[PDB]
Amino acid sequence: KVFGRCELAAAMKRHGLDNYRGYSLGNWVCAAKFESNFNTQATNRNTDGSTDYGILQINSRWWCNDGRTPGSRNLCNIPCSALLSSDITASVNCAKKIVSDGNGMNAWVAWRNRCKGTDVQAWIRGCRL
């Protein structure tokens, strides 16, 4: 499923992401846009053999199990396929654990490179919230 911008904002807000760990709602919508283009079915292989999954491109090296990343951990205790549902609950709960591990949203390289320090409010502008 390809969310719309204001649709994903409201879905993130309902799952308690707005201002989670100090990060306003626009940061998370921006991060989803540049990691997945709002597509819950997005996947991308990394050079090391791991794969990134779902609307927030969560990495199989650390966070989920896909059965083909030798020596990885499964810290969210979840199969990576659960991160590809049209319901974003599993993705949101795993993001809350990632963003609390010490490096904040710098864990998402596109956030650091394309969202950090920008007018992130523009991403929720005009949405009925």
Annotated binding site for substrate: 101
Answer with the entry of Na ion, Br ion, none that 5 interacts with (C-beta below 5 to 8 A by kind): Br ion
Part in contact with Br ion (CB under 5 A); list of ranges 44-52, 70-78, 90-98, 111-119: 70-78
Residues between 90 and 109 with contacts to Br ion, criterion CB under 5 A? 104
What distance lies between CA 121 and its chain's CA centroid? Answer: 18
Minimum CB distance to Na ion smaller for 1 or for 96: 96
Inter-residue contact 2 to 118 (CB < 8 Å): no
Cα 39 to Cα 2, 13, 79, 86, 104: the distances in Å are 4, 18, 18, 9, 23
Tell whether the torsion through CA atoms of 77, 91, 98 and 59 is positive or negative: positive
Pair 121, 9: CB distance under 8 Å? no
Between CA 79 and CA 6 the distance in angstroms is 28
Residue 52 annotated as catalytic: yes
Binding partner of 36, given Na ion, Br ion, none, CB within 5-8 angstroms per partner class: none
> Catalytic residue at 119?
no
Binding segment toward Na ion, per CB under 5 A, in 4-12, 15-23, 53-61, 118-126: 53-61
60 binds Na ion (CB under 5 A): yes
* Residue 72 touches Na ion, criterion: CB under 5 A: yes
Footprint of Na ion (CB under 5 A): 60, 65, 69, 72, 74
Residues tagged active-site: 35, 52
